[PDB]
Amino acid sequence: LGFLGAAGSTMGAASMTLTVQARNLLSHWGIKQLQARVLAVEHYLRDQQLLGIWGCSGKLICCTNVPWNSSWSNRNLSEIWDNMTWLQWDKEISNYTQIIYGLLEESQNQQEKNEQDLLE
Amino acid sequence: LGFLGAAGSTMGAASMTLTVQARNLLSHWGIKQLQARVLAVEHYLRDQQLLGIWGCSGKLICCTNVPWNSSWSNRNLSEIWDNMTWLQWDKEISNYTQIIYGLLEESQNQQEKNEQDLLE
Amino acid sequence: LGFLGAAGSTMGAASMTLTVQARNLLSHWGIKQLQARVLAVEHYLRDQQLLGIWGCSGKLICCTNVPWNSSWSNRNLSEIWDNMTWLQWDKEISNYTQIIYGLLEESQNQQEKNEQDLLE
Amino acid sequence: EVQLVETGGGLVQPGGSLKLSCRASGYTFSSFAMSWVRQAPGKGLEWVSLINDRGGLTFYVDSVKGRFTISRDNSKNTLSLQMHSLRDGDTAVYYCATGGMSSALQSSKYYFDFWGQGALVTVS
Amino acid sequence: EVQLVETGGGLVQPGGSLKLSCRASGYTFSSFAMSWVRQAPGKGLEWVSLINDRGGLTFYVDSVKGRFTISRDNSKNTLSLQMHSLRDGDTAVYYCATGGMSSALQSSKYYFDFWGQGALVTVS
Amino acid sequence: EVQLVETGGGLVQPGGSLKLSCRASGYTFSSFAMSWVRQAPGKGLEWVSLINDRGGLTFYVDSVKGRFTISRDNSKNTLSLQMHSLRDGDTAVYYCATGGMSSALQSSKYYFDFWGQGALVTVS
Amino acid sequence: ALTQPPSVSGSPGQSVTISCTGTSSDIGSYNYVSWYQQHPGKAPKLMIYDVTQRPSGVSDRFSGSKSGNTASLTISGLQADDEADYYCSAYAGRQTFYIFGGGTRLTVL
Amino acid sequence: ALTQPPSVSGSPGQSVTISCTGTSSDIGSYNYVSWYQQHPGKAPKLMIYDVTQRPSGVSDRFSGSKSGNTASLTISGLQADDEADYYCSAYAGRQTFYIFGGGTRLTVL
Amino acid sequence: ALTQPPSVSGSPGQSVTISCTGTSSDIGSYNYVSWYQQHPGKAPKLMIYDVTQRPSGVSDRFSGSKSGNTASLTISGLQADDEADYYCSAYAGRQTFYIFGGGTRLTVL
Ligand SMILES: *[C@@H]1O[C@H](CO[C@@H]2O[C@@H](C)[C@@H](O)[C@@H](O)[C@@H]2O)[C@@H](O)[C@H](O)[C@H]1NC(C)=O
Ligand SMILES: *[C@@H]1O[C@H](CO[C@@H]2O[C@@H](C)[C@@H](O)[C@@H](O)[C@@H]2O)[C@@H](O)[C@H](O)[C@H]1NC(C)=O
Ligand SMILES: *[C@@H]1O[C@H](CO[C@@H]2O[C@@H](C)[C@@H](O)[C@@H](O)[C@@H]2O)[C@@H](O)[C@H](O)[C@H]1NC(C)=O
Ligand SMILES: *[C@@H]1O[C@H](CO[C@@H]2O[C@@H](C)[C@@H](O)[C@@H](O)[C@@H]2O)[C@@H](O)[C@H](O)[C@H]1NC(C)=O
Ligand SMILES: *[C@@H]1O[C@H](CO[C@@H]2O[C@@H](C)[C@@H](O)[C@@H](O)[C@@H]2O)[C@@H](O)[C@H](O)[C@H]1NC(C)=O
Ligand SMILES: *[C@@H]1O[C@H](CO[C@@H]2O[C@@H](C)[C@H](O)[C@@H](O)[C@@H]2O)[C@@H](O)[C@H](O)[C@H]1NC(C)=O
Ligand SMILES: *[C@@H]1O[C@H](CO)[C@@H](O)[C@H](O)[C@H]1NC(C)=O
Ligand SMILES: *[C@@H]1O[C@H](CO)[C@@H](O)[C@H](O)[C@H]1NC(C)=O
Ligand SMILES: *[C@@H]1O[C@H](CO)[C@@H](O)[C@H](O)[C@H]1NC(C)=O
Ligand SMILES: *[C@@H]1O[C@H](CO)[C@@H](O)[C@H](O)[C@H]1NC(C)=O
Ligand SMILES: *[C@@H]1O[C@H](CO)[C@@H](O)[C@H](O)[C@H]1NC(C)=O
Ligand SMILES: *[C@@H]1O[C@H](CO)[C@@H](O)[C@H](O)[C@H]1NC(C)=O
Ligand SMILES: *[C@@H]1O[C@H](CO)[C@@H](O)[C@H](O)[C@H]1NC(C)=O
Ligand SMILES: *[C@@H]1O[C@H](CO)[C@@H](O)[C@H](O)[C@H]1NC(C)=O
Ligand SMILES: *[C@@H]1O[C@H](CO)[C@@H](O)[C@H](O)[C@H]1NC(C)=O
């Protein structure tokens, strides 16, 4: 039930502890420690900026409009969510991640523009 | 009308100056000043992260689905909002702070799952 | 198509590269470099706080309820969006920035209060 | 003593317009939501419109939604109603009343505490 | 073998209330959405209500929308339905069924996999 | 000179399908929203559907809402309409028109600037 | 909208009850019921609110209650001075904020 | 949807007015009224838009105006060649984007 | 809601087809069509789901299909044991989750 306690659990179970991990991301001699704190903050902010760009700001679970490609992974839902851990999943789809991120960004830009037109 | 000017006013009046205080949270010799600045940033981010977890991201006033327990405080609305300052209020219920925060987190996690299912 | 590539294009074109610029805002000898990094973070956070105050958190394009005053600029939309760049526009209205920001803040304060009453 | 005094109009032709207003005293005007309640000469009471204490939120009975505007001026302790298109069916006494809504940090209402005397509006 | 067993009520007067319950066994109760399907003595099947496996989301057919409550208890493997105002038109066999929905990370359902035998509810 | 040329279908049977297309030239196709306007043989004009300049947003009149699809290809300067279930009531001239909407950073429209000649669609 | 009877009556000293029946998404859902007393030619006065409460300024001879979709007003030590048209109203949600019944002409015998 | 008359007429040199009456959540709410001129057998041409404007390409003999829920088209120096079916239309909100009247047959005498 | 015929019949060994016609915002939009078999006095059994699938536990004599707004159930080597009321149902969106037809009484001759 503590930090990373669900790391060995399946994805569908581990997904219920998202706040456990999110809260553990924030908190010459003494400079290397000062540098570490600054770096940790910059890392954190980049992930938050990215969620913002994709339209997922403020939430831990975000549904999008980008379809899943079978070429990234052709496993079915039971096969994934009730069989694999997140560490295993992350390794399986690592090559195809920077493709997915690009698609999420493009999708949000189109959505924001459409919303703006609908408000004329 | 400046920072903390409303500190001695009642809760129902002070609540109209929330932007005044929010804007005053952000901005070897010289090191202790960097440490203070870095810590001020980390403090700020932890509060923002917490609002995110509770589903209050991006707003100064946020309603939730957690009912108020009469055991935390049994005062009625006039006692709390027409008179009573925020300093007094915080002291009155400081012992229930963690209970309330825990409830808010649980509520949002359930809300996210219900929303995800309603979109599938 | 890269960072600031659209700087010489008109506003109606440049508005489509907002994610290009947003992602380039984040990332004794060595101390002055930390000062620059800490400061860059604080700058970033102040802009995000301001968008939050105005009710534009999490989005790159945000519509508001503040009407445009012809005294700030009396140019029409086909002139501004099609025959002017953002650098030119920024100079044209640099004297009204603080007025506009004040109005946006006031508008959101009223919007939050109205929503709170509707949820009663 | 709380008073609400209508200082409204009289006899008007159908399809025209008529404005009502009400002055208040004896209480902080700005602390209460207000409403208009209508009573046709041979009928009971009908709710017509409701306005927030700050003037930002207004609600209408659907039968007048596209025809009536409700407003407020907290510096002049004045409630007002502007009616357009005046149907003959709108002949009634229009009462100024305090109550009908509250404001989140206040005890609830959902009833009317004070009434004025009522303006008689007649549409030919 | 999956078994759904209704243990319902009997004959009730119009305008009263009646509670049905269903006990389940032979499967992970908590993994499935459940619903109630009604069959009037002379008719076919009609969907009445649907509940999520976690008990958080409920859906109703409009005709009972303000009258029926569907609930769930995952610790007791129990599904329940509380009916109010019992119209004469509500006389039917009420079947406990597994299916009708699944949740996000699961493959889809949208059909019913298992049926109980049904409680008979009669309104006088 | 702006030209809109319909190259539509002909006579079809009820319940089937027919696809229309319109080729545009003389203006930047991508700068304008487009729509279809219908005229029954003995009637006036009726708006049927509207599509945004970028092709992402579409709007329909209720009478064809579940039956018609409007789409664009801005590389080929072509507007098209796919109609299904062809009601007899859909017999009309279908005109290709430019206008009906703007895109936020533009001056507004809400009127039609250009018309094609119209395809005749007949359903038996 | 709400149904309340005409012509409720009784002699001074006798109690009377004026009923008010609404619907489920009305009286049956919200405890925001009030009663008003209108003497002919005068503006209505509040007598009961929040189903059972009375404002300062009115007597304890007036008491509200409810069950199901029906609300009622009980008048105990009826006086000659109680002749009035009594009205019920209720909060009925955000789309249809308030509804009223017709008046009950209470006659004291 | 909109009402405009049939059989409008006058002799060359005489002005004519073609009215168009809609509703409040129509002409009464939005200033987006346009008029089109359709010669028999031809596609419609835009004559008036945004209530009072005319496009380049048309004469100044055509002028729009409105009051209340009624819009109108005035033709001044009426010509024999103005015979056409005139139509009014208006923006009517986001659920029902456009509505039209029937055609007005204008006959020049 | 859905229309399916009464009295479908045939002799043992003959195939039979039971049709189910719905609407566009029904069978024509969602591929979640299922069939149930109800012997009188018993709860219905699932025979077909997701238009063409069958659960483990039933024979391959039962095969579903669809086109347009019409679904159907085909039974091939008809048995005496197939006498039952067959019902079709379909997912019809989020406001009206499920609809059913009347029963088809299948008679074996
Ligand atoms: C998911 O697929 C199961 C069969 O999986 C097989 O082996 C894995 C490792 C992959 O190579 C896969 O493509 C193969 O088909 C089925 O038994 C199971 O029922 C399927 N589940 C769902 C929900 O479709
Ligand atoms: C309301 O509070 C009741 C009293 O328990 C006391 O207060 C809580 C918040 C804890 O601090 C506990 O240790 C104290 O003894 C609870 O029994 C009751 O369950 C609570 N109800 C709800 C709805 O929260
Ligand atoms: C709200 O409470 C006011 C004060 O009540 C008294 O003092 C408080 C601190 C408690 O000790 C309470 O038990 C006492 O009775 C009341 O005057 C006021 O009417 C109350 N508000 C409402 C709507 O009833
Ligand atoms: C619109 O602006 C008017 C003029 O304000 C003055 O000139 C502008 C350019 C600024 O320098 C400002 O600080 C000056 O006070 C106001 O009089 C008018 O109230 C404003 N508008 C609206 C729409 O309310
Ligand atoms: C936008 O304005 C263009 C130029 O108008 C003239 O110059 C500007 C800078 C102002 O001083 C203005 O008052 C002058 O008349 C027009 O050519 C163009 O048509 C206008 N756009 C629209 C949609 O009307
Ligand atoms: C789905 O994927 C198809 C093949 O995959 C493509 O090439 C591999 C090597 C990359 O890793 C993958 O990301 C590429 O997509 C594409 O041909 C097809 O266009 C893709 N479809 C959609 C909707 O994205
Ligand atoms: C580890 O795997 C076993 C099955 O071998 C399972 O029962 C247990 O719950 C799993 N532990 C966690 C943390 O998921
Ligand atoms: C994991 O996948 C295998 C594939 O052969 C399957 O047999 C097994 O049941 C799956 N386990 C879970 C928990 O889904
Ligand atoms: C990525 O591709 C390389 C190609 O050599 C492969 O070895 C590696 O396992 C892949 N990783 C995945 C599947 O994410
Ligand atoms: C301080 O209290 C007095 C009443 O004693 C009140 O009039 C005044 O407005 C209050 N000032 C502030 C800042 O709340
Ligand atoms: C606030 O008002 C109540 C009720 O009159 C009183 O009991 C309480 O002492 C007052 N407040 C404070 C903050 O001391
Ligand atoms: C908070 O807890 C401390 C320690 O038990 C106690 O002394 C104090 O009175 C409590 N405060 C309140 C408001 O209950
Ligand atoms: C620069 O101006 C030319 C016109 O002289 C235009 O074609 C070109 O697109 C402009 N550059 C950018 C980045 O828009
Ligand atoms: C600038 O205005 C002219 C008209 O004076 C117009 O032709 C041109 O298209 C406009 N510009 C741009 C850069 O799109
Ligand atoms: C802004 O104000 C200065 C005076 O401080 C003035 O000289 C300048 O022209 C103004 N800017 C514009 C675009 O008018």
Side-chain angles (χ1 to χ4, degrees), chain A, chain B residues 1-119, chain C residues 1-119, chain D, chain E, chain F, chain G, chain H, chain I:
Chain A
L1 297 175
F3 180 66
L4 303 176
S9 297
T10 59
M11 290 170 70
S15 67
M16 292 187 281
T17 63
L18 295 174
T19 59
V20 174
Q21 284 73 237
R23 291 176 292 168
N24 284 282
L25 300 175
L26 299 173
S27 180
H28 185 72
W29 189 259
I31 301 305
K32 67 181 185 178
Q33 294 85 341
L34 183 60
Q35 290 171 342
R37 289 193 297 274
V38 172
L39 182 61
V41 171
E42 289 180 354
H43 182 88
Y44 177 80
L45 292 174
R46 288 194 298 274
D47 286 344
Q48 293 297 308
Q49 183 181 52
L50 184 59
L51 290 170
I53 290 168
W54 296 345
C56 297
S57 175
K59 56 179 70 170
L60 300 176
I61 300 172
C62 180
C63 297
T64 75
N65 290 317
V66 175
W68 186 260
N69 201 320
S70 66
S71 70
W72 297 337
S73 179
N74 65 329
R75 295 190 186 274
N76 64 47
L77 292 173
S78 294
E79 186 181 0
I80 295 167
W81 287 103
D82 293 321
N83 233 338
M84 296 181 77
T85 66
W86 279 101
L87 291 167
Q88 291 171 314
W89 178 249
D90 187 67
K91 290 178 182 178
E92 179 176 348
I93 57 142
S94 173
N95 290 351
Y96 314 102
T97 308
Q98 303 292 318
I99 293 167
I100 293 168
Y101 291 177
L103 292 171
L104 291 170
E105 178 178 334
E106 179 64 26
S107 179
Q108 187 66 18
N109 286 342
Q110 291 178 28
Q111 182 181 327
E112 290 187 4
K113 187 67 177 177
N114 287 340
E115 289 178 355
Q116 185 184 49
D117 288 352
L118 291 171
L119 294 175
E120 179 171 1
Chain B
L1 297 176
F3 179 64
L4 304 177
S9 75
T10 63
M11 290 171 69
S15 67
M16 291 187 281
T17 62
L18 295 174
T19 59
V20 174
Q21 284 73 236
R23 290 176 291 166
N24 285 280
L25 299 174
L26 299 173
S27 180
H28 191 289
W29 190 260
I31 301 305
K32 69 181 188 182
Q33 292 80 0
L34 287 173
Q35 290 177 335
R37 291 174 69 189
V38 171
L39 293 172
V41 171
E42 289 185 340
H43 183 88
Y44 178 81
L45 292 173
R46 288 194 299 275
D47 285 344
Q48 292 295 307
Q49 183 179 49
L50 185 59
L51 290 171
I53 291 168
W54 295 346
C56 296
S57 177
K59 56 182 72 170
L60 300 176
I61 300 172
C62 179
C63 295
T64 75
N65 291 314
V66 176
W68 184 262
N69 195 327
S70 66
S71 70
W72 296 338
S73 176
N74 63 334
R75 294 187 186 273
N76 68 32
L77 293 173
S78 290
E79 291 175 70
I80 296 168
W81 296 104
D82 294 313
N83 70 302
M84 187 70 78
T85 66
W86 278 102
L87 291 167
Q88 290 170 315
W89 177 249
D90 190 73
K91 290 177 183 177
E92 181 180 356
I93 60 167
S94 69
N95 284 357
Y96 306 105
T97 298
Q98 295 303 314
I99 293 167
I100 293 167
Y101 291 181
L103 291 170
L104 291 170
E105 178 178 334
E106 179 65 25
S107 179
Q108 184 61 33
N109 287 342
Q110 291 180 27
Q111 183 185 323
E112 289 185 346
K113 290 299 298 182
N114 288 343
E115 290 172 355
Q116 185 181 35
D117 289 350
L118 291 171
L119 295 175
Chain C
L1 297 175
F3 180 67
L4 303 176
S9 75
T10 62
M11 291 171 70
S15 67
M16 292 186 281
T17 61
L18 296 175
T19 60
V20 175
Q21 284 74 236
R23 293 180 294 159
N24 284 282
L25 299 174
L26 299 173
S27 180
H28 186 73
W29 188 260
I31 300 304
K32 67 181 183 182
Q33 292 80 358
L34 287 171
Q35 290 173 342
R37 291 174 69 194
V38 172
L39 183 61
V41 171
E42 290 180 357
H43 182 88
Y44 177 81
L45 292 173
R46 288 194 300 275
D47 285 344
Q48 293 298 307
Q49 183 180 49
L50 184 59
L51 289 169
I53 291 168
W54 296 343
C56 296
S57 176
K59 56 183 72 170
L60 300 176
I61 301 171
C62 180
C63 297
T64 75
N65 288 320
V66 176
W68 185 261
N69 194 335
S70 66
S71 73
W72 296 337
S73 180
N74 62 346
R75 295 180 191 268
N76 63 59
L77 294 176
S78 68
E79 183 180 358
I80 294 167
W81 290 103
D82 298 319
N83 263 301
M84 182 178 283
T85 68
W86 279 103
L87 290 166
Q88 290 172 312
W89 178 248
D90 185 68
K91 290 180 182 179
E92 181 176 358
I93 60 167
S94 70
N95 285 326
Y96 310 118
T97 296
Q98 296 303 314
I99 294 167
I100 293 167
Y101 290 179
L103 291 169
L104 291 170
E105 177 177 331
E106 180 63 23
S107 179
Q108 186 63 21
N109 287 341
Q110 292 179 28
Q111 184 65 39
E112 289 186 349
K113 185 69 179 178
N114 287 339
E115 291 175 3
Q116 184 178 34
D117 288 353
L118 291 171
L119 294 173
Chain D
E1 182 177 271
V2 174
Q3 300 180 348
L4 298 174
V5 179
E6 298 86 353
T7 58
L11 178 65
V12 60
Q13 299 298 311
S17 67
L18 185 147
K19 183 175 182 178
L20 303 176
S21 65
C22 178
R23 298 296 306 278
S25 67
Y27 67 101
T28 301
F29 182 78
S30 65
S31 294
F32 297 86
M34 298 185 81
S35 68
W36 291 93
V37 178
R38 184 172 71 176
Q39 182 169 33
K43 302 293 184 182
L45 302 175
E46 182 181 10
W47 171 82
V48 177
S49 63
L50 173 66
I51 186 164
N52 190 281
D53 50 287
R54 292 179 289 104
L57 300 170
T58 60
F59 306 93
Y60 302 91
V61 66
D62 53 292
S63 67
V64 301
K65 184 174 179 180
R67 297 187 297 111
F68 291 9
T69 299
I70 186 167
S71 190
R72 173 184 283 267
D73 183 330
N74 285 333
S75 71
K76 295 195 287 290
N77 299 324
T78 299
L79 178 70
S80 66
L81 176 65
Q82 177 72 66
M83 301 179 282
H84 293 276
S85 303
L86 298 173
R87 294 177 180 173
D88 55 332
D90 291 319
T91 298
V93 176
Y94 288 76
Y95 292 95
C96 178
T98 300
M101 180 167 69
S102 186
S103 55
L105 305 181
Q106 296 292 304
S107 294
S108 65
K109 292 290 185 183
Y110 303 108
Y111 67 90
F112 303 105
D113 290 289
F114 300 97
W115 297 77
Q117 298 301 305
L120 174 63
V121 178
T122 300
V123 180
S124 295
Chain E
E1 183 178 86
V2 173
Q3 299 182 350
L4 304 176
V5 179
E6 301 88 350
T7 58
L11 180 65
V12 59
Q13 77 277 19
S17 67
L18 185 146
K19 183 175 182 179
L20 303 176
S21 65
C22 178
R23 297 296 307 278
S25 65
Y27 66 103
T28 302
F29 183 77
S30 65
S31 294
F32 295 84
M34 298 185 82
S35 68
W36 291 93
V37 178
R38 184 173 70 176
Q39 182 165 33
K43 303 293 183 183
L45 302 174
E46 184 180 12
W47 173 82
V48 177
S49 64
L50 172 66
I51 187 162
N52 191 281
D53 53 289
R54 295 187 303 279
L57 300 171
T58 61
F59 305 93
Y60 301 91
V61 67
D62 287 343
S63 67
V64 301
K65 183 175 181 179
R67 297 190 296 111
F68 289 12
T69 299
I70 185 169
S71 189
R72 185 182 174 99
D73 182 332
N74 286 329
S75 71
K76 296 194 288 291
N77 298 326
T78 299
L79 179 70
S80 65
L81 176 65
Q82 176 72 66
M83 301 181 283
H84 295 276
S85 303
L86 297 174
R87 301 288 87 186
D88 55 332
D90 291 322
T91 297
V93 176
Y94 288 79
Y95 295 97
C96 179
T98 300
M101 181 169 71
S102 69
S103 299
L105 307 180
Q106 295 180 307
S107 67
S108 64
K109 291 287 183 183
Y110 301 106
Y111 66 90
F112 301 104
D113 291 291
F114 300 99
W115 294 76
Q117 298 303 308
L120 175 63
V121 178
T122 300
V123 179
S124 295
Chain F
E1 183 177 271
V2 174
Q3 299 182 349
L4 302 175
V5 180
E6 299 88 352
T7 58
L11 176 64
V12 294
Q13 301 298 309
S17 68
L18 185 148
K19 182 175 183 178
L20 303 175
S21 66
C22 179
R23 177 67 56 79
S25 65
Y27 67 102
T28 301
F29 185 75
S30 65
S31 294
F32 294 82
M34 298 184 81
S35 68
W36 290 94
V37 178
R38 184 174 70 177
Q39 183 166 32
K43 302 293 184 182
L45 303 174
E46 184 180 12
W47 172 83
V48 177
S49 64
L50 173 66
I51 186 163
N52 203 2
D53 56 351
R54 292 181 290 105
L57 301 172
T58 61
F59 306 93
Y60 301 91
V61 68
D62 285 341
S63 67
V64 301
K65 185 176 282 176
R67 296 188 297 110
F68 290 11
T69 298
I70 185 168
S71 67
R72 285 170 64 146
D73 181 331
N74 289 339
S75 71
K76 295 194 286 289
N77 299 319
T78 299
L79 178 70
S80 67
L81 179 66
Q82 177 71 67
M83 300 180 280
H84 289 281
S85 301
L86 297 173
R87 300 287 88 189
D88 55 331
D90 291 321
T91 298
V93 175
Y94 287 75
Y95 294 97
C96 178
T98 300
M101 179 168 68
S102 298
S103 300
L105 306 182
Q106 296 178 314
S107 297
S108 66
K109 292 288 183 182
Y110 301 106
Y111 67 90
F112 302 106
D113 291 289
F114 301 98
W115 295 76
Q117 298 303 307
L120 175 63
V121 178
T122 300
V123 180
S124 294
Chain G
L2 299 171
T3 299
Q4 62 182 101
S7 300
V8 174
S9 68
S11 294
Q14 296 186 307
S15 65
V16 298
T17 300
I18 301 170
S19 66
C20 181
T21 300
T23 189
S24 294
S25 297
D26 181 12
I27 292 169
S29 293
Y30 303 98
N31 297 322
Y32 302 120
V33 179
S34 64
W35 293 83
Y36 301 88
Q37 179 175 310
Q38 182 175 39
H39 295 285
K42 302 295 185 182
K45 182 178 180 183
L46 180 67
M47 298 304 290
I48 300 293
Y49 67 94
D50 294 343
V51 179
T52 64
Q53 302 298 306
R54 65 181 64 83
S56 297
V58 302
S59 66
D60 58 344
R61 296 187 299 108
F62 294 86
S63 177
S65 68
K66 69 185 284 185
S67 179
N69 297 340
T70 300
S72 65
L73 173 65
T74 299
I75 301 170
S76 65
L78 186 68
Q79 301 298 306
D81 294 338
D82 294 336
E83 180 178 346
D85 289 345
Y86 290 81
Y87 292 87
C88 63
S89 69
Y91 179 72
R94 290 284 184 176
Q95 294 77 5
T96 57
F97 278 84
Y98 297 96
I99 61 172
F100 296 86
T104 298
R105 174 66 57 85
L106 176 64
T107 299
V108 182
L109 307 175
Chain H
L2 299 171
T3 299
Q4 62 183 103
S7 298
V8 175
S9 67
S11 293
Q14 297 186 310
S15 65
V16 298
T17 301
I18 301 169
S19 66
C20 180
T21 300
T23 189
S24 294
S25 296
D26 180 11
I27 292 170
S29 293
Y30 305 99
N31 297 322
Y32 302 115
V33 179
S34 63
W35 294 83
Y36 300 87
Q37 179 174 311
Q38 182 176 40
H39 294 286
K42 304 295 185 182
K45 181 178 180 182
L46 180 67
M47 297 303 291
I48 300 293
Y49 66 95
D50 295 334
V51 179
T52 63
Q53 301 298 307
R54 65 181 65 83
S56 297
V58 301
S59 66
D60 58 344
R61 296 187 295 106
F62 293 84
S63 177
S65 68
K66 70 185 284 186
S67 179
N69 297 340
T70 300
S72 65
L73 172 64
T74 299
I75 301 169
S76 65
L78 186 69
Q79 301 298 306
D81 294 334
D82 292 337
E83 179 177 342
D85 289 346
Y86 290 81
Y87 296 88
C88 63
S89 68
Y91 181 69
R94 276 79 186 172
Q95 294 77 5
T96 57
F97 279 77
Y98 298 96
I99 61 172
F100 294 85
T104 296
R105 174 66 57 84
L106 174 64
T107 300
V108 181
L109 304 173
Chain I
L2 299 171
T3 299
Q4 60 183 101
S7 300
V8 173
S9 67
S11 296
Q14 296 186 307
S15 66
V16 297
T17 300
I18 301 170
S19 66
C20 180
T21 299
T23 189
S24 294
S25 297
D26 180 12
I27 291 170
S29 293
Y30 305 99
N31 297 321
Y32 305 110
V33 180
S34 63
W35 295 83
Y36 300 88
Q37 179 175 316
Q38 181 175 44
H39 296 285
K42 297 187 179 181
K45 182 178 180 182
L46 180 68
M47 297 304 291
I48 300 293
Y49 67 95
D50 296 344
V51 179
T52 62
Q53 302 297 302
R54 64 181 65 84
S56 297
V58 301
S59 66
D60 59 343
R61 294 188 295 106
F62 291 82
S63 177
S65 69
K66 69 187 285 183
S67 179
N69 297 340
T70 300
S72 65
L73 173 65
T74 299
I75 301 169
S76 65
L78 185 69
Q79 301 296 306
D81 293 340
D82 294 336
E83 181 177 351
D85 289 347
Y86 291 84
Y87 295 86
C88 64
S89 69
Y91 180 69
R94 274 78 183 172
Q95 294 79 0
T96 57
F97 279 80
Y98 297 97
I99 61 172
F100 297 85
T104 298
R105 173 67 58 85
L106 175 62
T107 299
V108 182
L109 303 174

